[PDB]
Amino acid sequence: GPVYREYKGFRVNDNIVADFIGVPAVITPGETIEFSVFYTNRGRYAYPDTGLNLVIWFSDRDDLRREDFKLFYKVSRADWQEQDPAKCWDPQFPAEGGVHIACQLSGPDGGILSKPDGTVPLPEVESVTAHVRLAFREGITSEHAGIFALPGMLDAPGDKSIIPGLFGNVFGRLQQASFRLGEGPSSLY
Amino acid sequence: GPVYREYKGFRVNDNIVADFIGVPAVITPGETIEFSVFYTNRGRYAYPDTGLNLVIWFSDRDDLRREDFKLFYKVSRADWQEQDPAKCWDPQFPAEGGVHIACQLSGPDGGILSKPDGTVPLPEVESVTAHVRLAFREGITSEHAGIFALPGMLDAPGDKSIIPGLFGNVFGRLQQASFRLGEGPSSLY
Amino acid sequence: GPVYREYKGFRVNDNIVADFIGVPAVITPGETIEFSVFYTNRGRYAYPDTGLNLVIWFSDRDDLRREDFKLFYKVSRADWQEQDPAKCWDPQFPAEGGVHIACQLSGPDGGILSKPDGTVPLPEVESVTAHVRLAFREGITSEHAGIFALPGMLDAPGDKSIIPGLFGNVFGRLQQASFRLGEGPSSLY
Ligand SMILES: C[As](C)(=O)[O-]
Ligand SMILES: [Cl-]
């Protein structure tokens, strides 16, 4: 069994990391972007079932909700699907301000790692990708926002997910992508 | 106290890492790009005050100076500001050629981690972001350049910065973004 | 001497890592992109000779070959060159489908780390970059593809590369960039 750390009330294994590709540092309100994100087993313990969670957070306003953006994704080689608003955590409000909306992006990966019983085990060195399509509705903006990739794992076969709407009873290392939702930079020269 | 390694006579804690988002691999001279960069406490020691440093480096020429580019930044949810040329290191000249221009991008983060006395403590798992607007003047080019993100920390409360013009008496893990400054690639097909 | 783990019968040192800059999450068939990728020594053991390997992989088809894309690269401040198809591994076919084409992108870096004898030693904290130009021929597509950065090292000076066509008898930590080859996302709103 692997070593867990505690963060808030949850168990975190830093050996399950996540990487982003193609997140722009500025997103235009109303426009659709596609990026990729994948979590990888940098440890020696094979997890029996895994799935990605994504957290969308605005630091400078607290009114953003799941319905304020459109979110589609595809697990590795499987087909695209719309992210399910019922597979989300309720909005969380940090003590310093803002709001984050955590979304579950789990499911079979097209027969690369996934098994007939539906699990997506993560042997060492292996990875699972979500290709993600994201768009924020027009008229909403943020000057310091981010996406966090939160890998979710089931520690033992037949474990239950611990956060309502998210995948996993233990979690991997949070990965960040900071951006602004608004207008691009004016010329400095 | 955390474990430091010595590198070029400075104290480095590899548990304070940095990530880049949105850096292009080719930058057009004269054009403004915006990217984000953030440092994260991946260790268990909470630093009492922290700030980011950025190094702009050209490997194939040594004539670049701070005056050859315009640089603005914004710490997390604080306001945009112009980077201060007096809050920069003197040009450094590696033995193999080229020049590094080390720039301090510190300050309050808009009250997320920062405190009324101006300090930015970095608890574990926490991060601080700089949104960065950058443009190199027209007529300057480089075929192998990069930005290095150098997190700076004050190890104990009331410590003084050790590199004149930069923030910190100890430093985090150097993170790199390599790019060309010049023209994009012609179509290979 | 460093600690190796075994992976598919090869020796891997996770302290030699790789990072990507500017890989887009969607690449258009026929269009040329340029990105950079660099491997960094995050350990304390200096390797006497190093070189990057790049793997192009399609998960959803197995007919892709080295001839189906154009690949040029440049080691740090050395000159651009075309990747040599004879310095490639034979196509590898995972049992679950798809194909991987592993390509050697080694050589001197313009005298930054490289020495007159042609070797590229990698001291601690140091790094080697490849600027990469990549284009897939028109009419070929993939819904889940990626680039893997496989650092190659020689553990000892008189060691020989262990995979025909790739650099190294030991290898670093695999780094991934997942993308689709095809059309960008249509508007969700
Ligand atoms: C209540 As609303 C403006 O977040 O859809
Ligand atoms: Cl956009």
Which residues, including other chains, have CB under 8 Å from residue B27's CB and lie 6 or more apart? B33, B134, B136, B179, B180, B181, B182
In the block, residue with structure tokens 């060309």:
B180
Compute the residue count for chain C. 189
- DSSP secondary structure letter of residue B89: P
Are the beta carbons of B141 and B50 closer than 8 angstroms? no
Q: What single-letter DSSP state applies at residue B138?
A: T
- The string over A23-39, giving b where at least 16 C-beta atoms fall within 10 Å of a residue's C-beta and e elsewhere, is bbbbbbbeebbbbbbbb
Dihedral sign computed on CA atoms, order A71, A26, B37, B35: positive
| Residue in the block written with tokens 């783990």 | C5
In sequence order, the β-bridge partners of residue C41 are C16
What was the experiment behind these coordinates? Answer: X-ray
Query: What stretches of B23-182 show up as alpha helix (H) in DSSP?
Result: none
Amino acid at C177: A
Chain B residues in contact with A187 by the CB 8 A cut-off are: 31-32, 135
Ligand 1 atom at shortest distance from the alpha carbon of A140: 3
**Interatomic CA distance for residues A76 and C50, integer angstroms:** 31
Q: What is the fold of C23-181?
A: Immunoglobulin-like (2.60.40)
Structure tokens at B33: 């790009």
Look at residue A68 and give its three-state secondary structure.
helix
Give residue A58's identity as a one-letter amino acid code: F
CA C100 to chain centroid, in Å, comes to 12
> Partners of A69 in the beta sheet?
A136
Q: Which residue has the tokens 């930069």?
A: B166
Task: Residue B69: name the closest of B80, B55, B51 by CA.
Answer: B55
Cα angle for residues B39, A15, A179 (degrees, 5° grid): 35
Separation CA A58–CA A61 (nearest Å): 6
User: DSSP 3-state assignment of B163?
Assistant: coil
Angle formed at CA C96 by CA C184 and CA A111, multiple of 5 degrees: 65
- CATH fold of B7-150 reads Immunoglobulin-like (2.60.40)
Which tokens go with B68? 């050859």
> At a CB cut-off of 8 Å and minimum separation 6, what does A112 contact?
A76, A77, C59, C96
Distance CA A5, CA A9 (A): 10
Looking at 2.60.40, 3.30.70, 3.40.50, 2.20.25, the CATH number of the domain A13-140+155-181 comes to 2.60.40
CA of C158 to the centre of ligand 2 (A): 51
Residues A32, C189: C-beta atoms closer than 8 Å: yes
Under an 8 Å CB criterion, which residues of A touch C? 19, 21-22, 30-36, 38, 40, 42, 70, 72, 74, 76-77, 110-112, 124-125, 127, 129, 131, 133, 135, 137-138
Question: In the beta sheet, which residues pair with residue C71?
Answer: C134
CB contacts of B32 in chain A (<8 Å) are 185-189
Give the start-to-end residue ranges of the domains of chain C. Answer: 23-181
Neighbouring C-beta atoms of residue A101, cutoff 10 Å: 22
CA angle (B5, B6, B11) in 5-degree steps = 80
Q: Are strands C142-154 and C49-58 parallel, antiparallel or unpaired?
A: antiparallel
Q: A140 CA distance to ligand 1 centroid (A)?
A: 10
Q: Collapse the DSSP code of A67 into the 3-class scheme (helix H, G, I; strand E, B; otherwise coil) and give the result.
A: helix
Q: From the CA of A67, which ligand is nearest?
A: 1
Would you state the structure tokens that stand for residue B28, as one six-digit string? 């057009």
CA distance C172 to C127: 13
Q: What is the A67 CA–ligand 1 centroid distance (Å)?
A: 7
3-state secondary structure of C117: coil
How far is it, in rounded angstroms, from Cα A69 to Cα A78? 23
Of C143, C142, C149, C148, which Cα lies nearest the Cα of C127? Answer: C149
Asked if residues A94 and A100 have their Cβ atoms less than 8 Å apart, the reply is: yes
Indicate which of A144, A148, A176, A187 best probes the interface with B, i.e. most B CBs within 10 Å of its own CB: A144
Residue of C14, C15, C36, C81 to mutate, testing the B interface (most B Cβ within 10 Å of its Cβ) = C36
Resolution of the entry in angstroms: 2.1
Residue B117 CB-half CA count within 13 A = 6
C112 vs C127: CA distance, rounded Å: 10
Residues of chain B neighbouring C76 (CB-CB closer than 8 A)? 59, 144
Query: Quick one: which of C109, C107, C49 has its CA closest to C78?
Result: C109
**Among partner residues A23, A97, A189, which is closest to B135 by beta-carbon distance?**
A189
Q: Which atom of ligand 1 approaches the CA of A63 most closely?
A: 4
How many residues in chain A?
A: 189
Q: After which residues is chain B broken (C to N over 2.5 A)?
A: none
Please name the amino acid found at residue C91.
P
Distance of CA B1 to the CA centre of its chain: 25
- Residue pair A97/A64 in contact (Cβ under 8 Å)? The answer is no
Tokens standing for B85? Answer: 């040329």
Which one, of B98, B121, B117, B118, lies nearest residue B108 by Cα?
B118
A63 CB within 6 A, ligand 1: yes
Residue in B42, B43, B23, B25 with CA at minimum distance from that of residue B33: B23
Q: Which residues contact A117 (CB under 8 A, 6 or more apart)?
A: none
Q: Residue for token digits 């430093």?
A: B171
Distance of CA B176 to the CA centre of its chain: 10
Distance CA A60, CA A175 (A): 20
The number of helix segments (H) and strand segments (E) in chain B equals 0, 13
